[PDB]
Structures are given as structure tokens and as C-alpha cells.
Design an enzyme around this catalytic site. Sequence first.
Site, short mmCIF file in Angstrom:
data_model
loop_
_atom_site.label_atom_id
_atom_site.label_comp_id
_atom_site.label_asym_id
_atom_site.label_seq_id
_atom_site.Cartn_x
_atom_site.Cartn_y
_atom_site.Cartn_z
N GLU B 15 46.17 -18.13 -61.84
CA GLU B 15 47.61 -18.39 -61.90
C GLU B 15 48.37 -17.48 -60.94
OE1 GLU B 15 50.52 -16.53 -62.72
OE2 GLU B 15 51.85 -18.28 -62.54
N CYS B 62 55.60 -16.32 -67.48
CA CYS B 62 54.36 -17.07 -67.34
C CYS B 62 54.38 -18.28 -68.25
CB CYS B 62 53.15 -16.21 -67.69
SG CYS B 62 53.08 -15.79 -69.45
N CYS B 65 50.91 -18.03 -70.60
CA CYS B 65 50.91 -17.05 -71.67
C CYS B 65 52.30 -16.77 -72.24
CB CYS B 65 50.28 -15.74 -71.17
SG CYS B 65 51.32 -14.70 -70.09
N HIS B 69 54.45 -12.97 -74.15
CA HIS B 69 55.72 -12.33 -73.84
C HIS B 69 56.73 -12.53 -74.96
CE1 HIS B 69 54.80 -10.90 -69.85
NE2 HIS B 69 54.20 -12.06 -69.61
N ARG B 409 45.05 -12.27 -71.36
CA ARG B 409 44.49 -11.56 -70.22
C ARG B 409 44.49 -10.05 -70.37
NH1 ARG B 409 46.32 -16.26 -69.60
NH2 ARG B 409 44.96 -17.66 -68.39
N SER B 432 47.86 -8.63 -66.35
CA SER B 432 47.35 -8.70 -64.99
C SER B 432 47.95 -7.63 -64.09
CB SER B 432 47.56 -10.11 -64.40
OG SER B 432 46.71 -11.07 -64.99
N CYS B 476 46.77 -13.60 -63.59
CA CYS B 476 48.02 -14.30 -63.76
C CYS B 476 49.05 -13.44 -63.06
CB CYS B 476 48.30 -14.53 -65.25
SG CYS B 476 49.71 -15.40 -65.76
N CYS B 479 52.71 -12.87 -64.37
CA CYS B 479 52.76 -11.73 -65.29
C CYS B 479 52.66 -10.40 -64.56
CB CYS B 479 51.63 -11.82 -66.29
SG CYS B 479 51.93 -13.04 -67.54
N1 FCO Z 1 47.66 -13.62 -70.67
C1 FCO Z 1 48.59 -13.50 -69.97
FE1 FCO Z 1 50.07 -13.22 -68.91
C2 FCO Z 1 49.03 -12.16 -67.83
N2 FCO Z 1 48.35 -11.50 -67.16
C3 FCO Z 1 50.57 -11.71 -69.76
O1 FCO Z 1 50.87 -10.76 -70.28
S LIG Z 2 49.38 -15.26 -67.86
S LIG Z 3 49.82 -16.22 -74.80
#
Ligand code: FCO
Ligand SMILES: [S]
Ligand SMILES: [S]
Lengths: 283, 482
Positions: B15, B62, B65, B69, B409, B432, B476, B479
Site C-alpha cells: 500500500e 489508510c 487499516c 486509526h 502491520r 509502517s 502501508c 500510514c
Molecule cells: N495496519 C496498518 Fe496502517 C500501517 N502501517 C497503521 O497503523
Molecule cells: S495500513
Molecule cells: S485495521
Amino acid sequence: GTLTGERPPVFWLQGQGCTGCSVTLLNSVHPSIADVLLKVISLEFHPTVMAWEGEHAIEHMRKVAEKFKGKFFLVIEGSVPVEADGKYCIIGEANHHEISMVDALKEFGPNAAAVLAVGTCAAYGGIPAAEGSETGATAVSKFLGDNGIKTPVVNIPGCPPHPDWIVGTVVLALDAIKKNGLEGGLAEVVKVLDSDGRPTPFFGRNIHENCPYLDKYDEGVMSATFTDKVGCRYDLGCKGPMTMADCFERKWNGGVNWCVQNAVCIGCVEPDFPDGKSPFYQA
Amino acid sequence: TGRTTIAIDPVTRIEGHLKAEVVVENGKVVDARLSGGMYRGFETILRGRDPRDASQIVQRICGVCPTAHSTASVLALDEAFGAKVPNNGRITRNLIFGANYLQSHILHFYHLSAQDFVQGPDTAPFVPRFPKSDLRLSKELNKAGVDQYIEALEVRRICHEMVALFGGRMPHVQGQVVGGATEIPTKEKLVEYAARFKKVRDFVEQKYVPVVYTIGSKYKDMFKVGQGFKAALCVGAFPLDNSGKKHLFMPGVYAKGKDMPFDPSKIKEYVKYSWFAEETTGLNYKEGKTIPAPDKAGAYSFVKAPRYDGLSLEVGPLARMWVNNPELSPVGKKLLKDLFGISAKKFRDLGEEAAFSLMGRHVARAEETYYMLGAIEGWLKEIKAGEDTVVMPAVPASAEGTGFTEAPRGSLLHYVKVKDSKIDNYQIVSASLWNCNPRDDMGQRGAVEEALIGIPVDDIQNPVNVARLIRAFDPCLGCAVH
Ligand code: FCO
Ligand SMILES: [S]
Ligand SMILES: [S]
Ligand code: SF4
Ligand code: SF4
Ligand SMILES: [Fe+2]
């Protein structure tokens, strides 16, 4: 479609996006995303899902773009940041030269059959363009217009859009093109866009006037806690009155819920999202 | 052979926006630099807003995910507001978020990673690709990978139906707010969640966990590379009671062969090699600052460089499973013996070297998916239909709070400071970010940069293992930069 039928080439470029517009598309029920990819379009470049990588992926897109000049569909997910000479979004590198989102849209934009601005960021600027930002995040239609690029733009907003709005707008366009050819078909699509560039089959109706809690709104019966599902959500911040989308009917994720039932509408398809829809949790 | 320098931009089947540049000498990577090339600036966008808006705004960091958050944000707001989440709301949040772990890990293995090992059908976006892609599976096992990729498209969609049942929609849930969860689970909707969960469980147990070990057994060389620092972080996630002290994943740090407690005050974010103003370097997140400097000489990323007491750490399923050392799944135990000759009972029985490896990170993610099934099953037994899930707290004029959780992640924290009833500062230290960051002010590499050292590149014209290693960490970059 069929595995051996006509499928137009699509390049999917991500600018200042969160990948939510790709993920929402993966949630399409009918047709399934597998059927879209194998039977409806030919997704030739998409950084999240494609096999190849790097300069080789960029060059593959460029080879397809040359072969299908004027005829490919360009999906943009995310806004286009113009500050700092485009440096807030680099999408690739080829020939030892970085390619910003600004560069990519100036390269491919003029040669697309149409640009589909998917999501509120691409359509209208969205969160990256909101107060407190400093990247020059710009909507696709404004960026193209500022740069003299006349390619037709269709906005499919939402944060994220519902998959049916994305797939359905593609299908709208392909039906029109099958009946009228490319230019005639795109003219028929433009005829069914509202003043914000949105297809009226999906965005032509208001949330609130079609809301199942409208009788409570008119009676002044307002929920004081999110978990009271009897009252209207207006005092909790619902922006349904100002929002044009068909979520009240289509609902979300296979029909299992939608924002007004669960909490509030935040007006995510509207050109002023987020700042004109904030604060989210008061009227 | 001498040196070849290879730049990959975009790194695909991750991502977000990532460039990797590696120095190869004599058939191995000897240096690496990761660049997160896209910036939005959520930490400045958030300033001045009603703090309750954060739990919507931050999700747009994101689309893969957003529940993570959402969770970190509502936990930070809960703390700042002094909101006491009802027990049933704690459980409902766990059901909303846990369902996206299933979605994300399945998405990662099949739709992002599997093409590293599996040849897809002869049409875009599965072709063209490297002429020598090192795809070793028999016709039958390759076909199993393709068939499971296709099935997994449905399974991951079902996981998002599970999220939406109490979350409203997905991506970008409406159902988590300060004070709890906005919709009380009904008996009928709990039946619907459980029916979908059964289908996901069957796919995880019968298809996904077995295929990762089976493919891994054809790529045993991939357990011998990608170790990096062999250092890991977990900040805790999925509270199991209302005390704040017991979690499905408990916190801990692991470095230089030693378990240590997690003390968040030891986090500092460095910027020498990041596109931020030099005077912001070295700040703990409670005093964090985000001042972009896209023209700063020498910098190569919009990702800051987080360090824990000076250490460069990784995060994610390997990190959590190593720190917590749960029992392995029954099928993992069996396939480790049958296909690898390994006798193992708990995750650490894989040994540090094999766990901290390219393929070990895929294994850890599959094992964690199986582990999450039992947690969700437990929450479906514990939840009480009809019991209230939210309180409605007033916005404070002056407050601070920090939310800690684990995104799919890796470790995620959000810190908020409120003044005059508005966001004064909001700082995010994400998964990430810990993995895909550049060098710190001392020149120490980020976790993935270091894990690239030693990666084999026997064919510079088909350098497939560079991005294979990167993908094992499930990057990602939305993120990482925010
Ligand atoms: N899983 C996810 Fe997004 C990322 N890296 C976050 O925090
Ligand atoms: S993510
Ligand atoms: S998530
Ligand atoms: S304010 Fe929201 S909940 Fe109330 S009737 Fe309008 S759309 Fe429905
Ligand atoms: S109900 Fe409102 S916030 Fe939810 S998807 Fe529809 S327009 Fe967006
Ligand atoms: Fe940050």
C-alpha cells in the site's frame, strides 16, 4: 462479460490517496471484483495489485498508453499536490527521473478517453486539501483545467465511494459508448452529471428526504445518545440534509448497515467535505 | 561481481508510495534506502478542530487499516475526555476491529504477496512481469494459489461485512467514537456476524494457514535471509477487561536477544534523513512537531525515523507473536514437522533466525490470523445483546490523552492535546513508520532497510527478492507518512 470479450484498458494512478477507493472497489458484490477484472476492464497499471514493479511497470503503462492513445480510461485516486514543484507526491521513477503526480497527470491526462476522479480527494480535494494542509492538494478537474487539458472528467465521490458507484459509472459509460461510440457516448455521460460532476443515478437523490427517520426529524424527536436508534440523528451531527447520495437505499457492505443507522452521515460525497461538514458530532 | 545499484519506484503490491534503492555487490544487497514519497500532513490538518472529529479524520490515513486509526484515536480521546467506555462497548470495539485483522492479513498474503510465488492468469494485472520471476510451484500448487486468491477476494469482502455490522461501513467506520461504540449489537446481527465468521474461519484453517507453510516449504531459502536487527516492538492491543492492564497482545520490546518492558517515554522521532525541519529532530511524540521541508538536502523520505531508546525496531505479526510467544496452530505444528522437520509447540520454537526472516514474517501473519479466530470466538461468547455500548462525554477545554493499539502491520499510537476545546497538537506514530523509515540522525538504518542487507540478487536483471523482502513486512506508506 467473458474472459474473451472486449475490455478497455484502465490505468489507476494514486496521488494523495489512502487506498480506500481501491479497497471499496474490492468489496463490489455484483459484479464481483474478479468479474470486473477478468470480464469488464483490463487493469493494466495499478500499484497495489499488479504483478510487475518499478520502472518496468511505468514503462508497461507507457507502452499501453501509446497503443491506446485517446482510448484508455484513467482513474485517479487521491488529490494532486502542486506545492514544492510536485514533490509531495512522487509516483515512480524511470530513466533516472522521478515522476510526480503533477507530471503523471500532465503526461497521461491529455491522452485518456476520460478521467474518472474516484473519491472525494480526487473529485474535490477532500481531506488533503482541508484547513491546516500545506501541500497544494488540488482536485483533478481543477488541475486539468489549470493546465489546459480538456479531457472529460467524471467525478465519483465519497470517502470512500460505494463500490456500486464506481462500477456503475464504468458500466454507464460503457453502455453509452456501445450505443454511440466514444465521443458520442461520453457526451451522453456528461448529460447525466450534476453541477458537481456526479452521475445522477447515484447522486441525484438527497439522503434526508429519503431517510427512514424523517418522521422523527419533523416531530423533533432527537436521539441524545448514539445508541438510541429510534430518534433522528440531527442533534448528534447528521449531515443527511446537505448530502446527495443513495446510501439510504443501497446501504453498505452487502446491505448490512449504513452510516445513518449506525451513527451519523458525515456528508462524505459533498464538495465541501470535510470542513463544511465539520464538526461531525454537532449540528 | 562488483556493484550494481537498483532503484524500484513504485514498489508495487504494497500500500502507498514507496521507492526502494539497494546497492548489490557480489550477488547480495549490501546497502539500502527506503523513501516514502507522498505526504498529506494529517498532524497539521487536525489542528483547531473539535477533538471528536479526529476519530473520523484519522481513518483517512489508510483505507486498508482505518479501524486501527479509529481505535487509537478513540482510545486517546477516551483518555483525554475521561470517558469510561462500558464493558459491552469495549467488546463491540474488539469485534469491529478484530474482523479487519482477518481482512487485512488475507488481503496481504493473497492479493499483495502471493504473486511473489504464484503465476497468475495471462491477462492484466497479472502480466507482464519479470521474465525470470523465480516461480517454483508445481502446476497443481500454483493453481491452488490462483484458486485461493480468487476465493480470498470473497472472504476478505465477507470480513468487511463483519466490520460493517457494528461499524456502519468499511472502509472508514462510523461506529467507534469517544465513549465506546455507536450501535448496540442485537441478537439478530450477532447471528449474522457469527455466520460470516464461520466462513472466514473455515478458509483460514483449511486454505490460508496450510498454503503459507506449503509454499514456504518450496522456498526454504527464504527463512535464511531478511533477519535485519532481529529487534521487535509491541505496545499492546485488544483490551480483555476494563482495567487497561490486560490485552490479547501484551506489550514488550525485544532487542539484542533480550526481552524488555515497553516504556513509551523512550520513543523519539529523528528527521536528519526525512523531509522535515532540522530543528524538529529527536522529539518524543508528546512534544512532536511536523514541519515539512521537501527541499532539505540529504533527506530521502517523508517517513520520520522512530527509535526506542536509540534502537531501530520492527513491528507487525512477527513482532507481536515473538513478544507474546503463543502456542502455534495445530496445522502449523503438523506442517512444521511434516514439511520442515521442525518440532515446535510455541512460536519462539521456530528460533530467532527463522522467525525473523522473509518467509518467517509470512508464517507469523498466518499464525496470527489463526490466533485472532479464538479471540473473536471469545468475544462472541462474552458480548451481551442489547447492553449499552456508549457514554456521551462533554468536550474538555484542556486535556491530553494517548491511545495505544496494534494495527495489522504493527504498533500504533495517537497522542492528542486539547486547548480551548480544540485540537492543539495531534501526533501519530504508526506501524509502517516503525518498519519503513529511513536512517536516524546517527546513520542507523530503519528496520526494513536493515532487513534488506544480505538479500540475494543472483540476477540483477530479475532482482525479485528485493521487493519480496519488502512485501513480507506488509508496508502501508499512507500510514508511515500520514
Ligand atoms: N495496519 C496498518 Fe496502517 C500501517 N502501517 C497503521 O497503523
Ligand atoms: S495500513
Ligand atoms: S485495521
Ligand atoms: S437528520 Fe439524518 S437521521 Fe434525521 S431524518 Fe435527516 S438524514 Fe435522517
Ligand atoms: S451515509 Fe453519508 S457519510 Fe455515509 S457513505 Fe453515504 S454520504 Fe457518506
Ligand atoms: Fe507522525
